[PDB]
Structure formats: structure tokens, C-alpha cells
Ligand binder design. Structure first.
Ligand SMILES: [Zn+2]
Ligand SMILES: [Zn+2]
Ligand SMILES: [Zn+2]
Length: 178
């Protein structure tokens, strides 16, 4: 197994996957690494199994159909993995915890949102469709763009949104277009 956490790239108290060489901090993995279960298979492994059981699940899909899917166990997993892929980027630190807004010439958003809030909401099964999760994720970046206006710090939102969108198209096998 790897000697660093796959998500945050730090050593520490790591749990090792049984079916691949990745390792995780307890609360870096999503869902949090399960208490027992030997062998244990990480989210990367569980996603790969879904694809292997249904190869046709990788044919192209329309985003509008994906968003209306109910959050059954396989869609719950896919959203958990998508969330984890964002945390994998170090720039996610900016969007992880609860923001506050006091900048001359800007007003804070009407509906603040952050990664750890989305994480709790998934854990508590608060989303009934994929659209719920994707709307809250996109809201994070939209709030940031609007608040920071012309400051160059706006670019951090563009950057992390691009990680989210690339991973969304991959995980949910969105039909490729120009
Ligand atoms: Zn970690
Ligand atoms: Zn694994
Ligand atoms: Zn199948």
C-alpha cells in the first residue's frame, strides 16, 4: 500500500485498501473508513466494480437525465466519489469550511455553501436526486465568483469548478461534445 493518504497526500494514521494500493485517513475517505469489514475496499475500488458489472454504464448520457436520477445506492456512491475527487485537489481548502463575507464593495451570497456542508448532507441522506448534490456543488463556485468580482482570487473558483466538472463528466459518463 501507499504510505500517504490518497486525498491529502500526508502521512498519519492510514487505513489501507485490500484490493488496491491506496491508503486513507479515516475522515479523508468518503464515506469515513468503515469500523470493521475485512477485507475493505475503498471507494475507487467500489466505483470500478460498478463499471465492471455493467460495462454499458460507460456509454454516453445526457446531463439532464443524470440530474433527475434518484439517489439510490449506486448514485449515492458516485456523488460521494465526485465529492472526494474535489477534496483531492489542494485548492479545495478554500471551499471546505464555512465562509464569511466582509469585503468593501461586495455583499455575501444569499445561500452560502461549502464542501463540508455537502459532505454532511450526503452522510445524512438529505439529497433525493443527483440534481440536489450537483446544485449545491455548483453553488459553491458561483457564490465565490460573484463575491470576489474582479479580484484575481476569483480564479480559485474557476479552477476548482473545472475539477468538479471534469470529474462529473467522467464519473457519470456524460456524452462527449464539442
Ligand atoms: Zn488524508
Ligand atoms: Zn481500493
Ligand atoms: Zn449491465
Amino acid at each position: 500500500n501507499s504510505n500517504i493518504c490518497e486525498v491529502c497526500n500526508k502521512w498519519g494514521r492510514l487505513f489501507c485498501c485490500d484490493t488496491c494500493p491506496r491508503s486513507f485517513h479515516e475522515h479523508c475517505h468518503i464515506p469515513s473508513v468503515e469500523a470493521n469489514k475485512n477485507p475493505w475496499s475503498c471507494i475507487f475500488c467500489r466505483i470500478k466494480t460498478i463499471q465492471e458489472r455493467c460495462p454499458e454504464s460507460q456509454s454516453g448520457h445526457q446531463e439532464s437525465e443524470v440530474l433527475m436520477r434518484q439517489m439510490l445506492p449506486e448514485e449515492q456512491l458516485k456523488c460521494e466519489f465526485l465529492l472526494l475527487k474535489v477534496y483531492c485537489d489542494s485548492k479545495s481548502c478554500f471551499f471546505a469550511s464555512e465562509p464569511y463575507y466582509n469585503r468593501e464593495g461586495s455583499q455575501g451570497p444569499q445561500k452560502p455553501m461549502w464542501l463540508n456542508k455537502v459532505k454532511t448532507s450526503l452522510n445524512e441522506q438529505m439529497y433525493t436526486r443527483v440534481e440536489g448534490f450537483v446544485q449545491d456543488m455548483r453553488l459553491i463556485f458561483h457564490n465565490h465568483k460573484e463575491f470576489y468580482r474582479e479580484d484575481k482570487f476569483t480564479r480559485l473558483g474557476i479552477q476548482v469548478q473545472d475539477i468538479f466538472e471534469k470529474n462529473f463528466r467522467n464519473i457519470f459518463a456524460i456524452q462527449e461534445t464539442s
